[PDB]
Amino acid sequence: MGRILREGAGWRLGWDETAHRYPGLVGTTDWAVELTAAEMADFCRLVQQLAETIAAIAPELMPEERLQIEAESALLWLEAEGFADAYELRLILASDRRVEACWPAAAVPALVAATHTLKGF
Amino acid sequence: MGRILREGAGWRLGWDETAHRYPGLVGTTDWAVELTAAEMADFCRLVQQLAETIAAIAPELMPEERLQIEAESALLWLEAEGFADAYELRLILASDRRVEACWPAAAVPALVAATHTLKGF
Numbered sequence: 001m002g003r004i005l006r007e008g009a010g011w012r013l014g015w016d017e018t019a020h021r022y023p024g025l026v027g028t029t030d031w032a033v034e035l036t037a038a039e040m041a042d043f044c045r046l047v048q049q050l051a052e053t054i055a056a057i058a059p060e061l062m063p064e065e066r067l068q069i070e071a072e073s074a075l076l077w078l079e080a081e082g083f084a085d086a087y088e089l090r091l092i093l094a095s096d097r098r099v100e101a102c103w104p105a106a107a108v109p110a111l112v113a114a115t116h117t118l119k120g121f
Numbered sequence: 122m123g124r125i126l127r128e129g130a131g132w133r134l135g136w137d138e139t140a141h142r143y144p145g146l147v148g149t150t151d152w153a154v155e156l157t158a159a160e161m162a163d164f165c166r167l168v169q170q171l172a173e174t175i176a177a178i179a180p181e182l183m184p185e186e187r188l189q190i191e192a193e194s195a196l197l198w199l200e201a202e203g204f205a206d207a208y209e210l211r212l213i214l215a216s217d218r219r220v221e222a223c224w225p226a227a228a229v230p231a232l233v234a235a236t237h238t239l240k241g242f
Contacts (some may be wrong), residue, residue, distance in 0.1 A: 022219070026178075027221065028144060028152075030221075030223035031149075031152045031220070031221060031222055031223060032220065032221040032223075033154070033218065033219075033220045033221075034218050034219050034220070035218075093218075096217060096218050097143060097154065097156075097217050097218040097220070098143070098154075098155050098157050099152070099153065099154045099155070099213075099218070099220055100148065100152060100153040100154075101151075102151035102152060103154055
């Protein structure tokens with residue numbers, strides 16, 4: 001898997017095999033942050049894990065509580081917050097230059113789908 | 122100047138003297154990125170430079186062209202785009218983990234004012 005930039009309404013996911021240290025990229029339309037291979041692997045794994053936990057929640061016309069689920073590794077921390085049919089995703093990187101990121105509910109499903117298009121790792 | 126976090130509607134600016142490598146912070150309400158001292162010094166200087174160029178433009182009820190001005194150093198690149206009374210600010214860091222950032226026009230004046238409250242450098 002060579003050099004792909006994916007993008008949509010409010011999100012970006014990129015990968016460059018040739019990059020010596022920072023081959024990954026995640027972002028909204030307006031912000032973006034570079035990631036190491038280890039972090040991009042973790043980003044996908046944990047984003048997909050959270051999405052799947054949430055999708056496994058039985059549906060409800062109007063749930064009483066907002067959901068707040070988190071998954072983390074040594075390299076990053078992720079949090080879903082909102083409702084099963086509309087939740088935000090927050091990211092905080094642990095290493096080197098730290099960055100805090102956030103995707104509105106509107107953008108999340110396309111981003112999650114985008115992470116499956118990195119079929120290596 | 123010790124440990125200050127400033128924040129307002131759509132922006133954050135922070136400084137921690139005690140931090141060994143990344144004492145600076147700039148962000149919107151939802152995204153944030155850490156900066157080295159050299160980069161925070163550059164961020165302020167260049168943001169204030171752009172703001173002042175723009176404020177020195179004679180006013181017009183409805184200008185024919187959108188403005189696009191940039192200032193850069195070895196460490197970062199900044200760009201104002203829009204109109205003198207309402208312009209966006211974009212940032213791209215050059216070193217280490219690179220980050221692309223952007224502040225909507227609404228947030229810019231308070232952020233610019235915030236950079237003057239780092240009266241050392």
